[PDB]
mmCIF file of C-alpha atoms (C1' of nucleotides) in Angstrom:
data_model
loop_
_atom_site.group_PDB
_atom_site.id
_atom_site.type_symbol
_atom_site.label_atom_id
_atom_site.label_comp_id
_atom_site.label_asym_id
_atom_site.label_seq_id
_atom_site.Cartn_x
_atom_site.Cartn_y
_atom_site.Cartn_z
ATOM 1 C CA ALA A 8 68.463 90.723 165.319
ATOM 2 C CA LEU A 9 65.599 90.875 162.820
ATOM 3 C CA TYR A 10 65.724 92.491 159.396
ATOM 4 C CA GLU A 11 63.207 94.564 157.425
ATOM 5 C CA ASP A 12 64.473 95.299 153.923
ATOM 6 C CA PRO A 13 64.331 99.082 153.179
ATOM 7 C CA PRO A 14 61.643 100.179 150.706
ATOM 8 C CA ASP A 15 62.044 99.803 146.970
ATOM 9 C CA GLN A 16 64.149 102.546 145.380
ATOM 10 C CA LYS A 17 62.860 102.622 141.804
ATOM 11 C CA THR A 18 64.825 105.632 140.539
ATOM 12 C CA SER A 19 68.472 105.663 139.445
ATOM 13 C CA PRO A 20 70.924 107.812 141.430
ATOM 14 C CA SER A 21 70.754 110.371 138.581
ATOM 15 C CA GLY A 22 66.937 110.311 138.480
ATOM 16 C CA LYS A 23 66.229 107.755 135.745
ATOM 17 C CA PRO A 24 63.206 105.508 136.338
ATOM 18 C CA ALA A 25 63.859 101.803 136.601
ATOM 19 C CA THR A 26 62.799 99.951 133.461
ATOM 20 C CA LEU A 27 64.101 96.457 134.165
ATOM 21 C CA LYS A 28 63.259 94.266 137.148
ATOM 22 C CA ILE A 29 65.076 90.938 137.562
ATOM 23 C CA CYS A 30 64.258 88.420 140.258
ATOM 24 C CA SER A 31 66.461 85.463 141.213
ATOM 25 C CA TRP A 32 65.470 82.642 143.543
ATOM 26 C CA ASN A 33 66.901 79.352 144.742
ATOM 27 C CA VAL A 34 63.625 77.418 145.053
ATOM 28 C CA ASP A 35 65.302 74.242 146.400
ATOM 29 C CA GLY A 36 62.885 71.956 144.628
ATOM 30 C CA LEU A 37 60.753 73.673 142.015
ATOM 31 C CA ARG A 38 57.826 71.260 142.393
ATOM 32 C CA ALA A 39 57.765 71.751 146.163
ATOM 33 C CA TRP A 40 58.131 75.511 145.728
ATOM 34 C CA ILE A 41 55.180 75.554 143.336
ATOM 35 C CA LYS A 42 53.004 73.535 145.715
ATOM 36 C CA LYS A 43 54.041 75.912 148.487
ATOM 37 C CA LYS A 44 52.587 78.693 146.327
ATOM 38 C CA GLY A 45 55.829 80.153 145.014
ATOM 39 C CA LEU A 46 54.339 81.115 141.670
ATOM 40 C CA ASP A 47 51.819 83.287 143.494
ATOM 41 C CA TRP A 48 54.643 85.355 144.958
ATOM 42 C CA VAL A 49 56.208 85.789 141.501
ATOM 43 C CA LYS A 50 52.975 87.053 139.924
ATOM 44 C CA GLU A 51 52.757 89.641 142.729
ATOM 45 C CA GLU A 52 56.424 90.553 142.210
ATOM 46 C CA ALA A 53 55.931 90.531 138.402
ATOM 47 C CA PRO A 54 59.578 90.684 137.256
ATOM 48 C CA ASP A 55 60.747 90.997 133.667
ATOM 49 C CA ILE A 56 63.114 88.097 134.245
ATOM 50 C CA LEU A 57 63.006 85.276 136.779
ATOM 51 C CA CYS A 58 66.116 83.195 137.394
ATOM 52 C CA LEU A 59 65.524 80.010 139.363
ATOM 53 C CA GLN A 60 68.178 77.880 141.063
ATOM 54 C CA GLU A 61 68.227 74.307 142.418
ATOM 55 C CA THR A 62 65.122 73.286 140.474
ATOM 56 C CA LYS A 63 65.681 69.527 140.940
ATOM 57 C CA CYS A 64 63.323 68.989 138.041
ATOM 58 C CA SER A 65 63.844 68.002 134.410
ATOM 59 C CA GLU A 66 62.137 69.942 131.652
ATOM 60 C CA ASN A 67 59.507 67.303 130.921
ATOM 61 C CA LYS A 68 58.406 67.209 134.593
ATOM 62 C CA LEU A 69 57.781 70.962 134.906
ATOM 63 C CA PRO A 70 54.199 71.567 136.155
ATOM 64 C CA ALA A 71 51.639 73.195 133.923
ATOM 65 C CA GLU A 72 51.241 76.405 135.932
ATOM 66 C CA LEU A 73 54.737 77.302 134.677
ATOM 67 C CA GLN A 74 53.443 77.702 131.120
ATOM 68 C CA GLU A 75 50.384 79.796 132.080
ATOM 69 C CA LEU A 76 52.721 82.692 132.878
ATOM 70 C CA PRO A 77 51.942 85.279 130.153
ATOM 71 C CA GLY A 78 54.479 87.926 131.238
ATOM 72 C CA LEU A 79 57.248 85.306 131.450
ATOM 73 C CA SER A 80 56.616 83.103 128.421
ATOM 74 C CA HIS A 81 60.241 82.640 127.263
ATOM 75 C CA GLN A 82 61.631 79.826 129.421
ATOM 76 C CA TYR A 83 64.939 77.964 129.268
ATOM 77 C CA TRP A 84 65.928 75.115 131.487
ATOM 78 C CA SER A 85 69.173 73.336 132.225
ATOM 79 C CA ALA A 86 69.302 70.191 134.339
ATOM 80 C CA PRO A 87 72.201 67.752 134.886
ATOM 81 C CA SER A 88 72.679 64.748 132.649
ATOM 82 C CA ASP A 89 73.431 62.073 135.254
ATOM 83 C CA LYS A 90 71.854 63.032 138.608
ATOM 84 C CA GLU A 91 68.052 63.135 138.603
ATOM 85 C CA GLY A 92 66.524 65.492 141.159
ATOM 86 C CA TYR A 93 69.792 67.409 141.674
ATOM 87 C CA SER A 94 70.879 70.988 140.841
ATOM 88 C CA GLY A 95 69.201 72.562 137.779
ATOM 89 C CA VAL A 96 68.621 76.227 136.871
ATOM 90 C CA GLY A 97 65.920 78.127 135.020
ATOM 91 C CA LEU A 98 65.548 81.420 133.231
ATOM 92 C CA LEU A 99 62.170 82.916 132.317
ATOM 93 C CA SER A 100 61.836 86.303 130.613
ATOM 94 C CA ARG A 101 59.044 88.536 129.342
ATOM 95 C CA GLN A 102 61.031 89.410 126.223
ATOM 96 C CA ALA A 103 62.936 86.737 124.313
ATOM 97 C CA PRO A 104 66.710 87.150 124.590
ATOM 98 C CA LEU A 105 69.121 87.370 121.686
ATOM 99 C CA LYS A 106 71.252 84.374 122.754
ATOM 100 C CA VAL A 107 70.831 81.592 125.282
ATOM 101 C CA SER A 108 73.553 79.105 126.111
ATOM 102 C CA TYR A 109 74.325 76.594 128.853
ATOM 103 C CA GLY A 110 77.507 76.106 130.834
ATOM 104 C CA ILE A 111 80.748 78.045 131.169
ATOM 105 C CA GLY A 112 82.667 76.511 128.297
ATOM 106 C CA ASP A 113 84.749 73.955 130.301
ATOM 107 C CA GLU A 114 83.704 70.289 130.290
ATOM 108 C CA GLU A 115 84.645 69.240 133.802
ATOM 109 C CA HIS A 116 82.178 71.973 134.858
ATOM 110 C CA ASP A 117 79.173 72.063 132.458
ATOM 111 C CA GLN A 118 77.862 68.632 133.449
ATOM 112 C CA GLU A 119 75.418 69.708 136.172
ATOM 113 C CA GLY A 120 73.083 72.346 134.789
ATOM 114 C CA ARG A 121 74.356 75.196 136.953
ATOM 115 C CA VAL A 122 74.605 78.125 134.525
ATOM 116 C CA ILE A 123 72.424 79.791 131.895
ATOM 117 C CA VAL A 124 73.736 82.711 129.849
ATOM 118 C CA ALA A 125 71.041 84.997 128.413
ATOM 119 C CA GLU A 126 72.087 87.874 126.154
ATOM 120 C CA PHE A 127 69.895 90.985 125.718
ATOM 121 C CA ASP A 128 70.211 94.204 123.710
ATOM 122 C CA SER A 129 72.160 96.153 126.339
ATOM 123 C CA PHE A 130 73.370 93.573 128.886
ATOM 124 C CA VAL A 131 74.315 89.916 129.336
ATOM 125 C CA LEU A 132 72.547 88.023 132.125
ATOM 126 C CA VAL A 133 74.222 84.960 133.687
ATOM 127 C CA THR A 134 72.555 82.906 136.383
ATOM 128 C CA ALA A 135 74.494 80.422 138.503
ATOM 129 C CA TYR A 136 73.956 77.705 141.099
ATOM 130 C CA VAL A 137 77.577 77.551 142.251
ATOM 131 C CA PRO A 138 78.720 74.132 143.498
ATOM 132 C CA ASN A 139 78.521 73.665 147.246
ATOM 133 C CA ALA A 140 81.646 72.658 149.170
ATOM 134 C CA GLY A 141 79.537 70.047 150.965
ATOM 135 C CA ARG A 142 79.382 68.632 154.477
ATOM 136 C CA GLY A 143 82.941 68.282 155.742
ATOM 137 C CA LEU A 144 84.346 70.162 152.722
ATOM 138 C CA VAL A 145 84.288 66.955 150.654
ATOM 139 C CA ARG A 146 83.908 69.065 147.486
ATOM 140 C CA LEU A 147 85.811 72.233 148.460
ATOM 141 C CA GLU A 148 88.764 71.441 146.210
ATOM 142 C CA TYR A 149 86.334 70.918 143.337
ATOM 143 C CA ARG A 150 84.640 74.187 144.286
ATOM 144 C CA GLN A 151 87.930 76.048 143.962
ATOM 145 C CA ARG A 152 88.565 74.597 140.518
ATOM 146 C CA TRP A 153 85.032 75.664 139.575
ATOM 147 C CA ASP A 154 85.557 79.218 140.826
ATOM 148 C CA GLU A 155 88.637 79.731 138.684
ATOM 149 C CA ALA A 156 86.891 78.435 135.591
ATOM 150 C CA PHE A 157 83.733 80.470 136.219
ATOM 151 C CA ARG A 158 85.888 83.556 136.866
ATOM 152 C CA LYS A 159 87.690 83.236 133.529
ATOM 153 C CA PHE A 160 84.406 82.534 131.759
ATOM 154 C CA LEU A 161 82.804 85.729 133.032
ATOM 155 C CA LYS A 162 85.767 87.947 132.221
ATOM 156 C CA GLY A 163 86.044 86.505 128.731
ATOM 157 C CA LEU A 164 82.501 87.802 128.344
ATOM 158 C CA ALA A 165 82.078 91.000 130.299
ATOM 159 C CA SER A 166 84.298 92.612 127.691
ATOM 160 C CA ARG A 167 81.659 92.834 124.929
ATOM 161 C CA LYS A 168 78.580 93.731 126.962
ATOM 162 C CA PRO A 169 78.086 94.565 130.639
ATOM 163 C CA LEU A 170 77.439 91.649 132.938
ATOM 164 C CA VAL A 171 74.595 90.811 135.264
ATOM 165 C CA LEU A 172 75.386 87.698 137.271
ATOM 166 C CA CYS A 173 72.710 86.540 139.727
ATOM 167 C CA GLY A 174 71.885 83.395 141.650
ATOM 168 C CA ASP A 175 73.226 81.266 144.477
ATOM 169 C CA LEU A 176 76.995 81.786 144.740
ATOM 170 C CA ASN A 177 77.191 79.633 147.916
ATOM 171 C CA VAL A 178 79.547 81.973 149.784
ATOM 172 C CA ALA A 179 79.044 84.628 152.434
ATOM 173 C CA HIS A 180 81.644 87.144 151.255
ATOM 174 C CA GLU A 181 82.245 88.669 154.699
ATOM 175 C CA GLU A 182 81.265 88.209 158.352
ATOM 176 C CA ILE A 183 78.611 90.888 157.799
ATOM 177 C CA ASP A 184 76.945 88.348 155.469
ATOM 178 C CA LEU A 185 76.150 85.658 158.067
ATOM 179 C CA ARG A 186 74.935 85.432 161.650
ATOM 180 C CA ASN A 187 77.490 82.989 163.168
ATOM 181 C CA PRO A 188 80.665 83.786 161.184
ATOM 182 C CA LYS A 189 83.113 81.985 163.476
ATOM 183 C CA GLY A 190 81.217 78.803 164.293
ATOM 184 C CA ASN A 191 81.253 78.557 160.471
ATOM 185 C CA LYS A 192 84.818 79.092 159.288
ATOM 186 C CA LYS A 193 85.284 75.393 158.538
ATOM 187 C CA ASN A 194 81.723 74.994 157.154
ATOM 188 C CA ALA A 195 80.779 75.235 153.483
ATOM 189 C CA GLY A 196 80.071 78.797 152.432
ATOM 190 C CA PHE A 197 82.394 80.600 154.848
ATOM 191 C CA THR A 198 85.691 78.985 154.203
ATOM 192 C CA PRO A 199 88.610 81.322 153.557
ATOM 193 C CA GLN A 200 89.152 79.588 150.210
ATOM 194 C CA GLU A 201 85.539 80.242 149.215
ATOM 195 C CA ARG A 202 85.609 83.838 150.512
ATOM 196 C CA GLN A 203 88.821 84.836 148.732
ATOM 197 C CA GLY A 204 87.373 83.250 145.594
ATOM 198 C CA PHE A 205 84.450 85.678 145.764
ATOM 199 C CA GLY A 206 86.905 88.572 146.050
ATOM 200 C CA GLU A 207 88.822 87.080 143.160
ATOM 201 C CA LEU A 208 85.573 87.190 141.196
ATOM 202 C CA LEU A 209 85.005 90.839 142.210
ATOM 203 C CA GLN A 210 88.531 91.862 141.203
ATOM 204 C CA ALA A 211 89.135 89.799 138.085
ATOM 205 C CA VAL A 212 85.971 90.294 136.013
ATOM 206 C CA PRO A 213 85.490 92.858 137.621
ATOM 207 C CA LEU A 214 82.037 93.022 139.260
ATOM 208 C CA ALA A 215 80.244 94.865 142.079
ATOM 209 C CA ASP A 216 77.954 93.403 144.782
ATOM 210 C CA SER A 217 74.722 95.370 144.194
ATOM 211 C CA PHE A 218 73.402 94.889 147.711
ATOM 212 C CA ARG A 219 76.661 95.752 149.410
ATOM 213 C CA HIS A 220 77.257 98.714 147.118
ATOM 214 C CA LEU A 221 73.922 100.128 148.284
ATOM 215 C CA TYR A 222 74.162 99.016 151.934
ATOM 216 C CA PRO A 223 77.844 98.715 152.808
ATOM 217 C CA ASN A 224 77.225 98.323 156.523
ATOM 218 C CA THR A 225 73.687 96.987 156.866
ATOM 219 C CA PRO A 226 73.741 93.828 159.022
ATOM 220 C CA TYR A 227 71.463 90.818 159.522
ATOM 221 C CA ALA A 228 70.450 90.784 155.820
ATOM 222 C CA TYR A 229 70.401 87.137 154.738
ATOM 223 C CA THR A 230 68.846 85.179 151.875
ATOM 224 C CA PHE A 231 69.251 81.612 153.246
ATOM 225 C CA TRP A 232 68.222 79.953 156.500
ATOM 226 C CA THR A 233 68.565 76.279 157.297
ATOM 227 C CA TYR A 234 65.284 74.465 157.779
ATOM 228 C CA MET A 235 66.816 73.035 160.917
ATOM 229 C CA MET A 236 66.102 74.518 164.350
ATOM 230 C CA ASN A 237 63.812 77.351 163.181
ATOM 231 C CA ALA A 238 66.869 79.230 161.949
ATOM 232 C CA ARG A 239 64.600 81.416 159.850
ATOM 233 C CA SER A 240 62.467 82.704 162.721
ATOM 234 C CA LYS A 241 65.559 83.533 164.738
ATOM 235 C CA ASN A 242 66.873 85.269 161.555
ATOM 236 C CA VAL A 243 70.054 83.180 161.974
ATOM 237 C CA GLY A 244 70.962 83.035 158.317
ATOM 238 C CA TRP A 245 73.394 83.608 155.462
ATOM 239 C CA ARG A 246 73.558 85.803 152.373
ATOM 240 C CA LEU A 247 74.256 83.393 149.504
ATOM 241 C CA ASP A 248 72.326 85.053 146.662
ATOM 242 C CA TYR A 249 73.782 87.983 144.754
ATOM 243 C CA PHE A 250 73.356 90.382 141.922
ATOM 244 C CA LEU A 251 76.856 91.202 140.653
ATOM 245 C CA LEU A 252 77.252 94.050 138.163
ATOM 246 C CA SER A 253 79.753 95.264 135.662
ATOM 247 C CA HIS A 254 81.084 98.659 136.770
ATOM 248 C CA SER A 255 79.341 100.421 133.851
ATOM 249 C CA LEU A 256 76.008 99.278 135.331
ATOM 250 C CA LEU A 257 76.225 100.956 138.718
ATOM 251 C CA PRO A 258 75.060 104.243 137.155
ATOM 252 C CA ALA A 259 71.961 102.223 136.158
ATOM 253 C CA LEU A 260 71.493 100.523 139.578
ATOM 254 C CA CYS A 261 68.325 101.572 141.413
ATOM 255 C CA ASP A 262 67.922 98.909 144.090
ATOM 256 C CA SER A 263 68.883 95.399 145.181
ATOM 257 C CA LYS A 264 66.234 93.864 147.447
ATOM 258 C CA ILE A 265 66.193 90.898 149.803
ATOM 259 C CA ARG A 266 62.575 89.656 149.845
ATOM 260 C CA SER A 267 62.770 88.290 153.364
ATOM 261 C CA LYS A 268 59.092 87.305 153.671
ATOM 262 C CA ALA A 269 58.365 85.295 150.508
ATOM 263 C CA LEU A 270 58.182 81.625 151.423
ATOM 264 C CA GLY A 271 58.558 78.332 149.562
ATOM 265 C CA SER A 272 62.204 77.384 149.952
ATOM 266 C CA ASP A 273 65.025 77.649 152.384
ATOM 267 C CA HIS A 274 66.071 80.700 150.345
ATOM 268 C CA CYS A 275 64.185 83.898 149.784
ATOM 269 C CA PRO A 276 63.987 85.850 146.519
ATOM 270 C CA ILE A 277 66.228 88.741 145.629
ATOM 271 C CA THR A 278 65.147 91.459 143.225
ATOM 272 C CA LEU A 279 67.192 93.921 141.180
ATOM 273 C CA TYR A 280 65.970 97.214 139.704
ATOM 274 C CA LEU A 281 67.983 98.678 136.851
ATOM 275 C CA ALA A 282 67.408 101.809 134.781
ATOM 276 C CA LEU A 283 68.150 101.252 131.088
ATOM 277 C "C1'" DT B 29 74.852 74.179 160.267
ATOM 278 C "C1'" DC B 30 73.415 75.282 164.735
ATOM 279 C "C1'" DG B 31 73.186 75.380 169.302
ATOM 280 C "C1'" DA B 32 73.747 72.418 172.864
ATOM 281 C "C1'" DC B 33 77.673 70.657 175.304
ATOM 282 C "C1'" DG B 34 82.371 69.371 177.647
ATOM 283 C "C1'" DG B 35 87.724 70.832 178.018
ATOM 284 C "C1'" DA B 36 91.375 74.228 177.998
ATOM 285 C "C1'" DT B 37 92.974 78.892 178.580
ATOM 286 C "C1'" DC B 38 93.621 84.208 179.551
ATOM 287 C "C1'" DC B 39 93.248 87.807 182.329
ATOM 288 C "C1'" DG C 8 49.554 54.255 141.326
ATOM 289 C "C1'" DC C 9 50.318 55.052 146.125
ATOM 290 C "C1'" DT C 10 52.841 54.774 150.584
ATOM 291 C "C1'" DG C 11 56.772 54.316 153.456
ATOM 292 C "C1'" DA C 12 61.948 53.022 154.196
ATOM 293 C "C1'" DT C 13 66.273 54.201 152.999
ATOM 294 C "C1'" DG C 14 69.857 57.124 150.794
ATOM 295 C "C1'" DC C 15 71.805 61.568 149.459
ATOM 296 C "C1'" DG C 16 72.860 66.424 149.232
ATOM 297 C "C1'" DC C 17 72.255 70.738 151.390
ATOM 298 C "C1'" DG D 14 85.104 82.644 187.360
ATOM 299 C "C1'" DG D 15 83.338 85.332 183.402
ATOM 300 C "C1'" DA D 16 84.428 85.577 178.777
ATOM 301 C "C1'" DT D 17 86.548 83.331 175.631
ATOM 302 C "C1'" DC D 18 88.269 79.644 171.045
ATOM 303 C "C1'" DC D 19 87.725 74.707 170.601
ATOM 304 C "C1'" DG D 20 86.674 70.109 169.097
ATOM 305 C "C1'" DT D 21 81.939 67.166 168.985
ATOM 306 C "C1'" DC D 22 77.033 65.460 168.470
ATOM 307 C "C1'" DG D 23 71.865 67.074 167.281
ATOM 308 C "C1'" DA D 24 69.637 69.245 164.040
ATOM 309 C "C1'" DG D 25 64.493 69.827 158.526
ATOM 310 C "C1'" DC D 26 63.595 69.674 153.995
ATOM 311 C "C1'" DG D 27 63.101 67.749 149.193
ATOM 312 C "C1'" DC D 28 63.900 64.108 145.757
ATOM 313 C "C1'" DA D 29 65.357 59.242 143.824
ATOM 314 C "C1'" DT D 30 65.054 54.243 144.105
ATOM 315 C "C1'" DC D 31 62.956 50.395 145.828
ATOM 316 C "C1'" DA D 32 59.584 47.131 147.729
ATOM 317 C "C1'" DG D 33 55.095 45.917 148.833
ATOM 318 C "C1'" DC D 34 50.540 45.681 147.439
#
DNA sequence: TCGACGGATCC
DNA sequence: GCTGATGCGC
DNA sequence: GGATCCGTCGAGCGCATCAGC
């Protein structure tokens, strides 16, 4: 069935106005996304921070319209060292962060430009493009090694400052989070090993799924639809993109949106509203 | 990855 | 420089 | 014999390299 995201709640549950707006988006080819007018949608959305995933573009090939963003002038890019036109994440912010770094500390895992860590006055923002288990699970065993490393990285960090993780985590945590959950239990993104890894992430760090903490039984709410077979029109889709919060940030949580209608990629944007 | 299939089974 | 085939990863 | 849980083949996009010109 079709899905219309509820309207933007811009006040904290104790009445504090939201002061920070973070948008995350797997653009699945930044240069295609831009040509398909993605930057227009971002200017309308006007976030304080934009996290981009699956850019498939090296820094020196970034189009010019990316610089002519005034309200997002601090930009940091991480692409892989070996594979051109593969993976790659971006982080653009209105206000310069205190610290930026790339990778999660391992070396088997910081070779693909999947993670940017941005530190701000009150919170630490991480953005991820989690490795996909691939067609026929060819990379699932790698994915599980990744998960454990990422998990330890986040914990060994969420214990100075509270943690905002956002981006494409390439798992539908529960059957609620996809349209065909049982035609998909041997497909990448709904394997038991992937799913339990997500829960491991939620318990170990710990974190909270912003969207599911505000809508614990809302169905049909996906961020990803395959280009194939008009999956997007039929709203047959998956929820792969998250905002995950430190517990001490739920008091500050105003809303976690799924921007179903923005086009330009096989994913749609997600937007977080915090009060700080 | 999804939505066609066949094939096999449970009342 | 441009197009189109072929390959690859989702 | 309607409602299953299966295994299979069909399914769009973007980007890189390469060859031709």
